[PDB]
């Protein structure tokens with residue numbers, strides 16, 4: 001009669017909360033999805049071992065098209081857990097699943113966990129200053145999405161920071177790197193000429209948030225575009241005007257140039 | 266040798282991540298602050314019991330004025346942890362404490378935890394649509410804060426949602442309710458008259474996020490301003506233009522008026 005949406009957190013199998021782990025252990029059935037994002041610092045086997053339960057992985061179609069046929073039936077007469085990377089319901093499509101639960105006569109509860117949306121606070125940038133968020137998607141065929149460029153423009157215009165989620169081919173386990181993201185943005189700039197993202201733009205890269213050793217780097221595009229930020233996942237941030245306290249953190253903690261103190265404050 | 270900033274999560278002691286617990290358990294000294302937020306479902310004793318260490322609570326003055334005199338000295342010869350509600354670097358000024366650690370020759374690490382900033386996903390509103398955030402501060406003396414009103418206006422103009430952190434007076438044990446926040450906004454509206462926040466404005470309230478049964482309610486101010494949302498902490502949200510799926514969730518899960526389903530595109 002109960003469905004639990006449990007977040008797995010940021011990077012490895014220990015990023016789940018104590019509450020989530022204990023609840024998952026008591027569930028009769030445990031499902032999971034790894035298409036909204038991945039858990040780069042662990043494996044399905046390591047998560048299964050920690051939970052002590054067999055974990056049935058569901059694809060995007062399994063969830064979007066057949067959630068009520070695969071998960072809800074068992075949730076009708078048993079305690080069922082649905083695991084997702086990060087914090088449940090941050091991914092736009094998750095919320096709706098709670099409605100399906102209601103219509104199936106199944107109760108649902110949400111067990112939160114850290115999300116990159118909030119973890120970016122480790123960059124030293126004030127969370128309240130983050131504006132609208134966006135995703136940089138790989139272009140392909142004759143399709144070249146550029147909406148994320150406009151998000152940056154509108155946020156920076158109001159002195160706000162822009163969080164850019166980078167594309168990921170979950171099934172193929174291919175992660176877009178911050179370098180690839182910067183290359184694309186310069187390419188979009190060259191096409192839109194809005195002076196939004198250039199070699200002189202200050203950016204912040206956060207890699208492997210959740211790990212005890214994430215890479216946090218800040219600097220101008222011209223200097224970071226070919227820097228090695230380590231293994232995925234990577235997140236790119238284009239900050240707006242900085243509070244001096246933000247700038248000092250970037251310099252002291254993220255190795256940013258002293259120049260940002262006079263150019264971006 | 267090291268200093269750990271470990272988040273405790275949204276509501277109770279089990280909201281800490283497994284990573285944070287295992288690390289805290291092995292630290293020599295454990296400090297904490299409980300003035301940046303309110304964990305309404307636990308107590309110091311329960312947290313102490315879970316971690317198996319005596320937790321020394323620090324006041325805002327202890328931290329802001331003497332963090333380097335109380336915490337850092339020990340971190341030079343021991344493994345020290347600093348616990349905080351939610352995520353240690355979200356809507357707090359704790360990030361700057363990492364600079365003090367550095368300048369003191371102390372390596373610091375951050376362990377994230379569920380944050381109210383991302384937990385808002387449970388309201389059904391798309392996280393990427395949230396714009397700048399703000400804090401509704403208690404007026405004091407002849408000083409009546411109003412900056413949060415302009416944040417809502419700017420976000421609403423762009424079709425973005427606004428997350429409003431509500432004030433807290435930890436030592437005085439005062440936790441601002443959504444009702445009180447709504448009252449203050451109506452007053453600011455009377456002054457500025459920007460038509461930003463009125464009796465007809467649609468709002469969303471989230472109370473005690475993190476608990477298994479948080480209060481999630483959506484409706485018009487005139488109808489919710491006197492409603493009982495349960496014990497604090499509370500958060501208030503002023504949605505921008507809604508996607509149909511957001512409206513459906515607000516109606517099905519947050520009990521909003523069915524008329525909002527009819528979106529004005």
Ligand SMILES: Nc1ncnc2c1ncn2[C@@H]1O[C@H](CSCC[C@H](N)C(=O)O)[C@@H](O)[C@H]1O
Pocket residue numbers: 274275276301302303350351352353354355356357379380381382429430431432433471472473474475498499500
């Ligand atoms: N569990 C909860 N439920 C509802 N609101 C919460 C909450 N936790 C925090 N808040 C809101 O956020 C304010 C504190 S600001 C600090 C937030 C904390 N660092 C975090 O990451 O969660 C509270 O006064 C309240 O307005």
